[PDB]
């Protein structure tokens, strides 16, 4: 994964 991608549930 990319660090700055959506870190939350249900992206």
């Amino acid at each position, epitope marked *: *994964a990319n*660090p*700055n*991608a*959506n*870190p*939350n*549930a*249900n*992206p």
Partner: antibody, heavy 123, light 107 residues
């Protein structure tokens, strides 16, 4: 009423281990990524770590990678920062922060921070 | 992994003045820029997100502009509540901050 309360800071001797805690209220903690950011008088604001909503993906700043560890207990609404091999440069106020809301955006920052916990590494 | 620098590092201004803080990225960050306000002994508070979007409850006298490598934070008319330190943060390549701009009262 999104709220984050840090705890566990204090005075420790160099080379020891300290675990910081961050407690969340006012939002579904299990559903959000979480951050640790620290601030010294002489290093400004410095990002430390991020952990995915489910505790899987974890990323670290190079200044702490290998020594610090981020984790979380979603059943306790608590974020953790485990600090090992502390050195004088790790003296700072440590803030926990909540990831920004899910949207169509590809890049994500933070929106709400806690009040901070002070770590002092001292001989 | 992108260096943000702010200018000036200290700004002295009067109540009612229009003030402008600039932030420069070492490389293009598109519009992935955030503006924070921090008062002494307090946590940073998010004012502007993705370059220009005012957060809920932040007064409209605050506005952010820019894209790429050059960004600006403007206060149309300074209130005593606005005297604080302001940080810019890029959030496209990890998360890095400028060194801060302390807006102090002129006398």
């Amino acid at each position: 009423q999104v709220l984050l309360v840090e705890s566990g800071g204090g005075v420790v001797q160099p080379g020891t281990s300290l675990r910081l805690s961050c407690v969340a209220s006012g939002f579904s903690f299990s559903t959000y990524g979480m951050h640790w950011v620290r601030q010294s008088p002489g290093k400004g604001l410095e990002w430390v770590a991020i952990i995915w909503y489910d505790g899987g993906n974890k990323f670290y700043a190079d200044s702490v990678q290998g020594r610090f560890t981020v984790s979380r207990d979603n059943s306790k609404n608590t974020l953790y920062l485990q600090m090992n091999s502390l050195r004088a440069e790790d003296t700072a106020v440590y803030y926990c922060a909540k990831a920004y809301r899910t949207s169509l955006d590809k890049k994500y920052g933070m929106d709400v921070w806690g009040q901070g916990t002070t770590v002092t590494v001292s001989s | 992994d992108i260096q943000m620098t702010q200018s000036p590092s200290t700004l002295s201004a009067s109540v009612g003045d229009r003030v402008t803080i600039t932030c420069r990225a070492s490389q293009s960050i598109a519009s992935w820029l955030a503006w924070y306000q921090q008062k002494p002994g307090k946590a940073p508070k998010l004012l502007i997100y993705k370059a220009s979007s005012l957060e809920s409850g932040v007064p409209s006298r605050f506005s952010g502009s820019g894209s790429g490598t050059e960004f600006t934070l403007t206060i149309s008319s300074l209130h005593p509540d606005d005297f604080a330190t302001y940080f810019c943060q890029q959030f496209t390549s990890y998360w890095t901050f400028g060194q801060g701009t302390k807006v102090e009262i002129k006398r």
